[PDB]
Write an enzyme that holds these catalytic residues in place. Structure first.
Site, PDB file in Angstrom:
ATOM      1  N   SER A 133     -11.665  10.935  -4.246  1.00 29.48           N
ATOM      2  CA  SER A 133     -11.141  10.657  -2.916  1.00 29.48           C
ATOM      3  C   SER A 133      -9.630  10.454  -2.974  1.00 29.48           C
ATOM      4  O   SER A 133      -9.052  10.373  -4.046  1.00 29.48           O
ATOM      5  CB  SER A 133     -11.848   9.492  -2.324  1.00 29.48           C
ATOM      6  OG  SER A 133     -11.579   8.281  -2.998  1.00 29.48           O
ATOM      7  N   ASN A 140      -7.638   8.745  -5.820  1.00 22.84           N
ATOM      8  CA  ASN A 140      -8.512   7.716  -6.400  1.00 22.84           C
ATOM      9  C   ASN A 140      -9.304   8.372  -7.555  1.00 22.84           C
ATOM     10  O   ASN A 140      -9.490   9.575  -7.593  1.00 22.84           O
ATOM     11  CB  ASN A 140      -9.452   7.155  -5.368  1.00 22.84           C
ATOM     12  CG  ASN A 140      -8.761   6.507  -4.194  1.00 22.84           C
ATOM     13  OD1 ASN A 140      -9.172   6.772  -3.038  1.00 22.84           O
ATOM     14  ND2 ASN A 140      -7.763   5.725  -4.480  1.00 22.84           N
ATOM     15  N   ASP A 180      -6.323   8.253  -0.770  1.00 24.25           N
ATOM     16  CA  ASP A 180      -5.878   7.296   0.265  1.00 24.25           C
ATOM     17  C   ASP A 180      -4.662   7.881   0.988  1.00 24.25           C
ATOM     18  O   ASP A 180      -3.731   8.389   0.330  1.00 24.25           O
ATOM     19  CB  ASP A 180      -5.509   5.969  -0.413  1.00 24.25           C
ATOM     20  CG  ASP A 180      -6.672   5.136  -0.934  1.00 24.25           C
ATOM     21  OD1 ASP A 180      -7.843   5.455  -0.730  1.00 24.25           O
ATOM     22  OD2 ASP A 180      -6.349   4.008  -1.517  1.00 24.25           O
ATOM     23  N   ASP A 222     -12.491   8.431  -8.130  1.00 22.78           N
ATOM     24  CA  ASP A 222     -13.730   9.123  -7.726  1.00 22.78           C
ATOM     25  C   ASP A 222     -13.430  10.500  -7.130  1.00 22.78           C
ATOM     26  O   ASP A 222     -14.416  11.083  -6.652  1.00 22.78           O
ATOM     27  CB  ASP A 222     -14.558   8.195  -6.858  1.00 22.78           C
ATOM     28  CG  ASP A 222     -13.922   7.882  -5.515  1.00 22.78           C
ATOM     29  OD1 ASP A 222     -12.818   8.438  -5.242  1.00 22.78           O
ATOM     30  OD2 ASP A 222     -14.632   7.283  -4.710  1.00 22.78           O
ATOM     31  N   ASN A 282      -8.972   5.487   2.933  1.00 21.71           N
ATOM     32  CA  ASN A 282      -9.674   6.261   1.908  1.00 21.71           C
ATOM     33  C   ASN A 282     -10.601   7.320   2.522  1.00 21.71           C
ATOM     34  O   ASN A 282     -11.474   6.997   3.329  1.00 21.71           O
ATOM     35  CB  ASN A 282     -10.454   5.249   1.071  1.00 21.71           C
ATOM     36  CG  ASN A 282     -11.018   5.798  -0.205  1.00 21.71           C
ATOM     37  OD1 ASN A 282     -11.059   7.008  -0.349  1.00 21.71           O
ATOM     38  ND2 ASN A 282     -11.459   4.941  -1.127  1.00 21.71           N
ATOM     39  N   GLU A 316       0.849  -1.225   0.000  1.00 20.74           N
ATOM     40  CA  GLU A 316       0.000   0.000   0.000  1.00 20.74           C
ATOM     41  C   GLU A 316       0.875   1.263   0.000  1.00 20.74           C
ATOM     42  O   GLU A 316       0.531   2.191  -0.744  1.00 20.74           O
ATOM     43  CB  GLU A 316      -0.977   0.018   1.179  1.00 20.74           C
ATOM     44  CG  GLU A 316      -2.088  -1.018   1.094  1.00 20.74           C
ATOM     45  CD  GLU A 316      -3.139  -0.727   0.034  1.00 20.74           C
ATOM     46  OE1 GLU A 316      -3.024   0.378  -0.609  1.00 20.74           O
ATOM     47  OE2 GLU A 316      -3.977  -1.609  -0.236  1.00 20.74           O
TER      48      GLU A 316
END
Ligand SMILES: [Pt+2]
Ligand SMILES: [Pt+2]
Length: 129
Positions: free
Chosen positions: A50, A46, A52, A48, A59, A35
């Site tokens: 958003s 991300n 992380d 959309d 998120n 990650e």
């Protein structure tokens, strides 16, 4: 902060993640490797809109407020910048909520595609835990 592998294993173990919801310590270390590369400062946008955040790439769609993810939830009740500290307490506490939500570690895409089903005990080999 970029953790070493056994440094991160010891911090995660101290904060209660080894066998949390039945996921051995090696699964958490493996997830953090893929990650964030063990980097508490990691951020990634991300599709959309958003983002992380942190060592476990939590998120802003669901878990934290970053001020730029309109219509999202804040289920850990924290600013997303708390997830970037050298101190992993906020990331661990939030991760415990995430993994307990019914989907387990499958919430972490890198865990699902890179760790799940593999010899994750290798991630704690040689550590004094
Ligand atoms: Pt803790
Ligand atoms: Pt939900």
């Amino acid at each position: 902060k970029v953790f070493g592998r056994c440094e991160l294993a010891a911090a995660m173990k101290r904060h209660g993640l080894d066998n949390y919801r039945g996921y051995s310590l090696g699964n958490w270390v493996c997830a953090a490797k893929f990650e964030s590369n063990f980097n508490t400062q990691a951020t990634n946008r991300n599709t959309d809109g958003s983002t992380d955040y942190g060592i476990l790439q939590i998120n802003s769609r669901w878990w934290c407020n970053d001020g730029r993810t309109p219509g999202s939830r804040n289920l850990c009740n924290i600013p997303c910048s708390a997830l970037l500290s050298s101190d992993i307490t906020a990331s661990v506490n939030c991760a415990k909520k995430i993994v307990s939500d019914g989907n387990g570690m499958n919430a972490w895409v890198a865990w699902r595609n890179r760790c799940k089903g593999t010899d994750v005990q290798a991630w704690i080999r040689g550590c004094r835990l």
